[PDB]
């Protein structure tokens, strides 16, 4: 039997406390006004085991505890663990053990399973999972926690599914995650009765959940219903005003996320320039260029954290995701007084005649005290720094010219006497020194991200390349959403002529294999939604800018959608305009004052019963 789910199945996505907010989540939910299976029971069964796709929305209106739990499993024949739940008189067991569920799934006293040899985690939870009244449960496995929800609500008189929102309160998260692809409803019988339960399947869809001040949910939108629902999930509100609005790609509702970030697995030798035997001096910094690596910055801050870990340009944390093309590691040792002068824009002693950072710098500088290893009884005399010069060094310059600085009228010829000195100075690192004289070893990491195949990326995992399907792609930092198609382009274009301010990515390259993949919009065409206001009515209209009333079914891919949208995106009283094709109105041949502008002078409103009409501008 088939029925309709009247906006039921909205649970709490996470456990974070939220109040008086509107949160847009992207978890698995039950679509509103979907087709649920109303499976009845007679007394051995009426239907075989149902396939578990993403989640199960179980509902029951019977009483006397006929439906006494549930049974899960993949093949149920000595292959994997089976999630068994049975509600006893007061207690309930959630024993996930190897069970041989036969063709007799009856309880009344255990006859559902045949035997059990290898039993995994078992729960002895005391609160029973049983309590007319509608018993709403939402079972969903997220590969590590099998979230089960429940909402006990007294049902109405002579009805099956009430007309009212009821959010399911979350329960404990059971540690599961073994493969589950099928679901079956467990039933009981006094003497070898009848029952009936609703079953629905969850899909990945966005949801705008509204939390009030008390911390409860009162209304939600599936973001996959009629264009009013998409308008509801693009303005972050529940009271759409009387006016034409836009929407986003909430139609196809992508379900997969592809990463494909890295290409190699060899760790980077970042523990080779931070713990060297003898760091370079100030006048000659040993720059090390590194490419074809793995940008694993987890070993940097977890290395007895140092002082002044100031990362410019990029964020200090969340660096294990953004991938660059090369990393330049400079390392030297200075005094404690000018440990902050090595920064973009700073000016001083080591920022004028020594290593200087550029104005725009997307690297990070980190220094650490070395008053225990870089210290001598009479002070270290090996380290040197330039202090007497005349040419301001440009960013990323090295000057190893040990020639005698000319400062007098007559040539010094190396005597370094009156009015003539040496550019280098041996500042000793005496132990008995203040904070402004302690030796600090400083390492600067410059991140070069050029228009070249990125080599040193983060430790992010590698997903599978699923093409010809609306997915969210994060190939090499380009986080977008679209359909990946196999194009026939020679080389990836580099759009830099008009600076591409209001532009988007058209094609990308897989970092693993060199294949130019074109990115197409899953559903677009300038979809404008004409709304007269939620306070007035609930009838809307659609406008597709760039069609001729015939290319609209193939533009938005009206093949796998809701049956409530095919009435506003088909040949139902269409009207071709100079801007597009208005579907969902009736063009009148009268003259009225102008109203909500649909496009190209066309004004429309909602009146007479009253319905959405359209008329040209009455000049």
């Amino acid at each position, epitope marked *: 039997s088939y029925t309709n789910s009247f906006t039921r199945g909205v649970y709490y996505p996470d456990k974070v406390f939220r109040s008086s907010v509107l949160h847009s989540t992207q978890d698995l939910f039950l679509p509103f006004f979907s087709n649920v299976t109303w499976f009845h029971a007679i007394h051995r069964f009426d239907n075989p085991v149902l396939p578990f796709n993403d989640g199960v929305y179980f509902a029951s209106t019977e009483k006397s505890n006929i439906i006494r739990g549930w049974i899960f499993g993949t093949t149920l024949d000595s292959k994997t663990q089976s999630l068994l739940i049975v509600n006893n008189a007061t207690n309930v067991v959630i024993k996930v053990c190897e069970f041989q569920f036969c063709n007799d799934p009856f309880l009344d006293e255990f006859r559902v399973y045949s035997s059990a040899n290898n039993c995994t985690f078992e729960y002895v939870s005391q609160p029973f999972l049983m309590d007319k009244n509608l018993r709403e449960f939402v079972f969903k496995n997220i590969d590590g926690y099998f979230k089960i929800y429940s909402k006990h609500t007294p049902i109405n008189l002579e009805r099956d599914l009430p007309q009212g929102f009821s959010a399911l309160e979350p329960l404990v998260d059971l540690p599961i995650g073994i493969n589950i692809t099928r679901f079956q409803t467990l039933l009981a019988l006094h003497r070898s009765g009848a029952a009936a339960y609703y079953v629905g399947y969850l899909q990945p869809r966005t949801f705008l959940l509204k939390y009030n001040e008390n911390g409860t949910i009162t209304d939600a939108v599936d973001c996959a219903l009629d264009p009013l629902s998409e308008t509801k999930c693009t303005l972050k509100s529940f009271t759409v005003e009387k006016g034409i609005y836009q929407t986003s790609n909430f139609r196809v509702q992508p379900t997969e996320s592809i990463v494909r970030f890295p290409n190699i697995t060899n760790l980077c030798p970042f523990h080779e320039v931070f713990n060297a035997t003898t760091f370079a001096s100030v006048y000659a910094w040993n720059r090390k260029r590194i490419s074809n690596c793995v940008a694993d910055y987890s070993v940097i801050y977890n290395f007895a954290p140092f002082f002044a870990f100031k990362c410019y340009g990029v964020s200090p944390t969340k660096l294990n995701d953004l991938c660059f093309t090369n990393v*330049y590691a400079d390392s030297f040792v200075i005094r404690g007084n000018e440990v902050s002068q090595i920064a973009p824009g700073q000016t001083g002693n080591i920022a004028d005649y020594n290593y200087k950072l550029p104005d725009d710098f997307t690297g990070c500088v980190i220094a650490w005290n070395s008053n225990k290893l870089d210290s001598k009884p009479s002070g270290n005399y090996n380290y040197l720094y330039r202090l007497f010069r005349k040419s301001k060094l440009k960013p*990323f310059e090295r000057d190893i010219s040990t020639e005698i600085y000319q400062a007098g009228n007559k040539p010094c010829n190396g005597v370094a006497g009156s009015n003539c000195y040496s550019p280098l100075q041996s500042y000793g690192f005496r132990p008995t020194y203040g904070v402004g004289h302690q030796p600090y070893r400083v390492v600067v990491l410059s991140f070069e*991200l050029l*228009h*070249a195949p990125a080599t040193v990326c983060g430790p992010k995992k590698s997903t599978n390349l699923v093409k010809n399907k609306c997915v969210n792609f994060n190939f090499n930092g380009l986080t977008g959403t679209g359909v990946l198609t196999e194009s026939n382009k020679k080389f990836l274009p580099f759009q830099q002529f008009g600076r591409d301010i209001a532009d988007t990515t058209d094609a990308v390259r897989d970092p693993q294999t060199l294949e130019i993949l074109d990115i197409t919009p899953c559903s677009f065409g300038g979809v404008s939604v004409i709304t007269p206001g939620t306070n007035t009515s609930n009838q809307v209209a659609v406008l597709y800018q760039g069609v001729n009333c015939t290319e609209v079914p193939v533009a938005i891919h009206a093949d796998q959608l809701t049956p409530t949208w095919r009435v506003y995106s088909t040949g139902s009283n269409v009207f071709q305009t100079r801007a597009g094709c208005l579907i969902g109105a009736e063009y009148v041949n009268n003259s009225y004052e102008c109203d909500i502008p649909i496009g190209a002078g066309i004004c429309a409103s909602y009146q007479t019963s009253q319905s959405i009409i359209a008329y040209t501008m009455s000049l």
Partner: nanobody, 119 residues
Framework: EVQLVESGGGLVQPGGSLRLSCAAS????????MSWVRQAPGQGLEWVST????????YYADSVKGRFTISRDNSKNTLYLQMNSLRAEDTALYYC?????????????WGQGTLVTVS
């Protein structure tokens, strides 16, 4: 603050190599990377190769791997490009662009470019 004039590539024949020069008048940044950008009639523009300004490591494209070579001379601040085995896909306009390694992908200096036709 200035422009980068180009010369060299005029009319060539299938099979050979011609030098492409890129000069600079008031350019003194020793860390800004310099690259070549090819644009063929019809489809958009593509990337040939680039030189890392922070060091001396050059990065070429996939089609120009074992046939192109770039060189940077800081004495007179010039860029030289030598392209070998120009069979059929080297008929385009080449631009000598310069951008900063730390920033966006968009270049910071647009040159005049020279048209090379392999016929």
């Amino acid at each position: 603050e200035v422009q980068l004039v180009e010369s060299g590539g005029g009319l060539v024949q299938p099979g050979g190599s011609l030098r492409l020069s890129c000069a600079a008048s008031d350019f003194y940044f020793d860390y800004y990377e310099m690259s070549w950008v090819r644009q063929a009639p019809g489809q958009g523009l593509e990337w040939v190769s680039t030189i890392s300004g922070l060091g001396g490591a050059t990065y070429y494209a996939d089609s120009v791997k074992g046939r192109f070579t770039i060189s940077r001379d800081n004495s007179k601040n010039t860029l030289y490009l030598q392209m070998n085995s120009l069979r059929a896909e080297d008929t385009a306009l080449y631009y000598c662009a310069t951008r900063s390694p730390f920033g966006d992908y968009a270049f910071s200096y647009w040159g005049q470019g020279t048209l090379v036709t392999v016929s």
